[PDB]
Design a protein around this ligand. Structure first.
Ligand SMILES: [Ca+2]
Ligand SMILES: [Ca+2]
Ligand SMILES: [Mg+2]
Ligand SMILES: [Mg+2]
Ligand SMILES: [Mg+2]
Ligand SMILES: [Mg+2]
Lengths: 241, 242
């Protein structure tokens, strides 16, 4: 209703930043050096794709490599979805700090006010900034469902904000629930400093890519991105490839 | 002489960013949220100092916390100096990736074109971006001189660029030489991609603070910072012979 967006990257040339998207590359919003000569980039690639010719290829690590899209004013909730292919797994990973593929941010220039989905402490899940809280709690770290390397996955994240008693997040892999934030006790460290409305101010930009706080370089490809304020799920082709 | 700058932080109020410096805090140049309410900052502090009442207190980690000074155009060399007090050590440290306290950068917006002195792979030394090369080589890693936690140190970094056959860096602790780069074989990964003039374009901004690529939070205090195109050293008081 406020946004119904899809992108398969098919109209953008190879080695170019996806048309219509901004970037967050090397900790800089709209880095002017997002190009195939750098070690960190977010560029269209026609050598791997889920549909059509093209995907977006993120090459990064500790230095983020992301595309970023503005979200409409007044969103209460958002759904992020993509076909995702990664060089390493997420989940069930000893030694991890945290790493993420999808998120929303409040301020374009900074990664210090955002919600980050991928894994935390080696379990699929979420990190919020600026609290630096993480979900799930410590009991579940370094275990749980895996998002395997070297295959296409259909990943969906639902973020429910606005006028409800407690903001929520649900993440899915191939339409199976793999992570939930339903109440304050789903956070490790006291629940985003006690803020029940913890998506407030976060839904200004959507971002996709690779960002590791575990010192791991990766290559990630995404295709068939969808962003909506109404629910999204994976279709027969995305499930059964 | 184009620059001969000293700062003891005595004229700035406590909890304020040092007057006349820029910042690089949480990966943003001149971050407007550099204040005592945040988890990452670079602020004047009177709870510890080497001279007078005040030092600059860096609180950071993976997220950098730094002050930044613009350097004059056309430097061929620069010396960076400070009294430094750290919550953890540099050097002789197992499992370290790299971390740094001093540096110079070419472009104010990014940490991807700079020279970084502190430790690399647990030995005191230097990391260059964008090559990501490190000095000394692998044989010396996780060993060598220590810059101990919880005491004041007088640290000097000498960077020699310009028209010489190979750019050099030397670092000194209490006037003792602890780290040198003066030949391509001092680099682990084959020498900044072959660039003999590897300080070219790097002497635009000097920075001081804490930045870990080893996921270590720290608190660092510095006092009596100096920047110059002529040599800088430590006086007997700074050496703490007592
Ligand atoms: Ca496509
Ligand atoms: Ca002082
Ligand atoms: Mg699949
Ligand atoms: Mg669809
Ligand atoms: Mg001393
Ligand atoms: Mg002096």
């Amino acid at each position: 209703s406020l946004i119904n967006f899809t992108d398969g990257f098919e109209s953008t040339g190879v080695n170019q930043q996806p048309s219509g998207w901004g970037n967050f590359v090397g900790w800089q919003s709209n880095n002017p050096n997002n190009n195939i000569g750098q070690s960190v980039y977010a560029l269209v690639d026609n050598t791997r794709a889920f549909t059509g010719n093209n995907s977006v290829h993120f090459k990064g690590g500790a230095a983020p490599a992301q595309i970023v899209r503005t979200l409409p004013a007044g969103l209460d909730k958002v759904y992020l979805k993509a076909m995702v292919y990664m060089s390493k797994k997420l989940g069930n990973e000893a030694g991890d700090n945290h790493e993420h593929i999808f998120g929303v941010r409040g301020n374009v220039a900074q990664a210090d006010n955002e919600v980050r989905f991928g894994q935390i402490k080696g379990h699929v899940g979420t990190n919020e900034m600026p609290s630096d809280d993480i979900s799930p709690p410590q009991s579940q770290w370094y275990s749980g469902p895996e998002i395997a390397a070297d295959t296409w996955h259909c990943v969906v994240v639902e973020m429910l904000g606005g006028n409800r008693p407690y903001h929520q997040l649900h993440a899915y892999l191939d339409n199976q629930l793999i992570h939930s934030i339903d109440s304050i006790s789903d956070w490790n460290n006291g629940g985003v400093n006690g803020n029940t409305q913890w998506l407030d101010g976060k839904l200004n930009y959507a971002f996709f890519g690779w960002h590791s706080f575990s010192n791991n370089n990766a290559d990630v490809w995404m295709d068939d991105i969808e962003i909506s304020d109404q629910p999204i799920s994976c279709d027969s082709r995305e499930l059964e490839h």
